[PDB]
């Protein structure tokens, strides 16, 4: 939460984004999350058009990896255009699980 | 004592409370909503709104509502008719201020999330099939569709093509236009009067006036037949009568008890029912007859209801209809009008006896008339009905245009023109 | 973590330590019968099992 | 602003009197313009034997159809012309007749009730006509599956006793019950050290007592015919009845252990325990979120249509258990999860679940006493069961004593290694074997 | 009808004193279910072989 | 002012949280089965009759 050196830390976040390479397969950040029972409930709560966009991006990246190839550089996901589409649905599923758990001990 | 405190807020809300000293409390919210306010593009929205009382709201999740009410042993229920919706909460006297906050969240701040509304659509099919195991449920929905062209023709249950397609935006539009403060009555039975008022300014912040202007109901004289495999024939035959809260409506109530409106003795032969004795002169099979009455804010229906075997259905309907003609040309004894007034008075005092019947009686008075009347004022209106007013109500039935609905094996049932 | 901490977790442990020491003491006296544990064989000398 | 404690003290009291006859007279005044008044009798099918098992239900049919002073339909015309209602019922232990009327027609209502229980005519031509109405009612009750299965449970739990027979009787008794069998039944069981005259609503006790001396004192005030019968108890037997029928769409199962009688103090912690198991139906609004474990599971997996727990009491013995309705591929998982809840209460029962079960029972007994007809029935059968009316303040001090270790103790006494009784109505091929049901009464860890 | 269904007599099979169906299942389960279940007692202490 | 349920005959459905779905006031109207042969048929889906609303405690 520093205010003067949050330009330094904005550059480290960009460096780590490029060094990880899901953008070279045309993926977004929320495509790569590990699917536990919590994440599987947020997936089935998505609207139809966002669910269909996610199934095609994953299928295309799984096909590039079978061939040991990547996309042309003009089609790499940019750092400022990655949409965190799954994050508001996941925070609500987790908040409901904490409430069933505080109820069971009290 | 303390008969009732009655207050109108400056934007329409009606608040009424009675302080008993009973161990249990009951609180109800009564709204002018219901199936007469939907048009042909959103049929069945009121049925799904009735089933959605324990979904997530802005102040409590769906887990907290079910767990919080069950922790103190309370109840929550919704009752609807063609013109009204009623939300009721009851528990023990020390817990009632916990359940009041839940009731104001269900009615004044609902959310309608997509994934919860989509899982509820299959409940519409279960609730309708349970209700239609009674053969009177489908006959009485077909009778309202035969009698009207719009508004009161709409059923209480969602149509079959429409199950699966009630959207969250249709639910948001219905509540925003019909659940407003000038259409609402808040009625308390074991609470105080200043505590309900402070509850009332927590939903006086929004939904401030009248809603929209449903249309007048136009009368249609129609017929709906339904051939099926049921073992008995149900049939109903009505005409247009009189609206709730007029001097002719009291005359139709007296005429219902002259003809007969249900038995008083377990397994008794109905010795003082006029309709039952006339049918039993020539029909020696099992049957049942009754007079039917239904009063609304701008119209009413009155007629007869028969249950018979299939080969006897025309004999029963003609014998019953011939008895109403005898009354309409003057044959009406004075000791019969007096015994009908006794059954009507005693039935009214027995129906306000429990806490559920009393709360319903006060809530329907506040929506239609905007006041409360004691049962001694009601009992005077019944005694002021004259014998000529009862004969005049039986002439309005006989000369009026008929509607009909029937179901069963209809191969010996008459058509409405025969 | 706090997913397992609460007044309900060791609630049913306090109900199950009698079902626990019986988990343990039976297996502890089960370990002498199997491999002829001879320094606890005559812990009580009434078992002269070895001839 | 009162409190729940202050409101229980303000409930009016019941006043009990007695005639030289032996008849008891009880009432509760409550300010209203309507009233209910009736007569409760200690008669029932557990007092009949094999030759007259239909007789007490034949007599309830003829009670509203003519006396010596009011022949035929003159009783019907007199009840209806004042706006009153007239009802009856008949269990295995009790019989009632009661009237709902205005609190101005109480002198006429008490005169009508005394004529019914003392001077019923029982004429031969009405007897042959009523024999056909009863034979058609037996066929109508065969299509109610809950009524058939609860009759099976009494026939197998109490096999060789008079508590096994049914209220209506078999069809061959109905066809043979003569007139002399019915007049002998009335002269033997309709006696007044055995009757209670109850009333509730707007009623004065002193006016009710004066009307009882006027109309009821003609009953003979002793036990002549020297019939002092010895009350002999009824054994419980663990056993089973299976009715296989594959053309029915759903299956009905009921399971019971032996419970306590009416006056046993174990009854209050045993219905805090049944309120923790609960009830369910497919039209309920909040499944998968419900506090009961059996209700939350049957809603999530769609395991049944409905279930409910029961606690049925008699003088010396009783039935305690549950009933459920499901399809043919679901019976085995239903019996597994239910027996796992009985065993989790014999051990492991928490203090937070016992607070919820006490709150449910407080609400159920004050909500049952709303109106003059449920109050008048609570007066008339408490005086035949307990000898008095337990006030609501005394029920509340017996509920406050219950804690988690009381519930954990009383459940182990009645459930833990006991032989249950089971009844089933088809399609029941997956109803588990009796050896596998009986093994489900003991545990694995504890 | 279903009211014509009664259980046939099982008194050919019962534990001897429990056949007296007048006394009720309170003293006749204190000492009825155990000695052939002490046959389960010796079938373990002897199962150890 | 007088209710739908005050004059007898128009319909009402009720829904719960813990109790069963109900319909109407005078639908199972008496002297229908009391002259004989009205069998009540069995379900593939429905509610429990007692509604639990009436148990003494």
UniProtKB/TrEMBL annotation, chain B:
Example GO BP: proteolysis
Keyword Acetylation among UniProt keywords: yes
Membrane topology: Peripheral membrane protein
UniProt domain Peptidase M16 N-terminal: residue ranges: 15-160
Alphabetical list of PROSITE patterns matching this protein: INSULINASE (PS00143)
Annotated localization: Mitochondrion inner membrane
GO MF, one annotated term: metal ion binding
Protein keywords: Acetylation, Electron transport, Membrane, Mitochondrion, Mitochondrion inner membrane, Respiratory chain, Transit peptide, Transport
Span of domain Peptidase M16 C-terminal: 165-344
Stated name of the protein: Cytochrome b-c1 complex subunit 2, mitochondrial
Record lineage: Eukaryota, Metazoa, Chordata, Craniata, Vertebrata
Automatic annotation (TrEMBL), chain C:
GO CC, alphabetical: mitochondrial inner membrane; respiratory chain complex III
GO biological process, one term: mitochondrial electron transport, ubiquinol to cytochrome c
Subcellular localization, as worded in the UniProt entry: Mitochondrion inner membrane
Keyword flag Mitochondrion: yes
Record Gene3D superfamilies: 1.20.5.220
Superkingdom of origin: Eukaryota
Family: Belongs to the UQCR11/QCR10 family.
Official protein name in the record: Cytochrome b-c1 complex subunit 10
TrEMBL record, chain D:
Compartments reported by the entry: Mitochondrion inner membrane
Gene this protein is translated from: UQCRC1
Protein name: Cytochrome b-c1 complex subunit 1, mitochondrial
Family under the similarity heading: Belongs to the peptidase M16 family. UQCRC1/QCR1 subfamily.
Keywords assigned by UniProt, alphabetized: Acetylation, Electron transport, Membrane, Mitochondrion, Mitochondrion inner membrane, Phosphoprotein, Respiratory chain, Transit peptide, Transport
Main location: mitochondrion
Species: Sus scrofa
Top-rank taxon, per record: Eukaryota
GO molecular function: metal ion binding
Lineage of the organism: Eukaryota, Metazoa, Chordata, Craniata, Vertebrata
UniProtKB/TrEMBL annotation, chain E:
Cell compartment(s), UniProt: Membrane; Mitochondrion inner membrane
Superkingdom of the source species: Eukaryota
Note from the entry: The Rieske protein is a high potential 2Fe-2S protein.
Family as reported in the entry's similarity comment: Belongs to the Rieske iron-sulfur protein family.
Name assigned to this protein: Cytochrome b-c1 complex subunit Rieske, mitochondrial
Biological source species: Sus scrofa
Range covered out of full length: 79 to 127 of 274
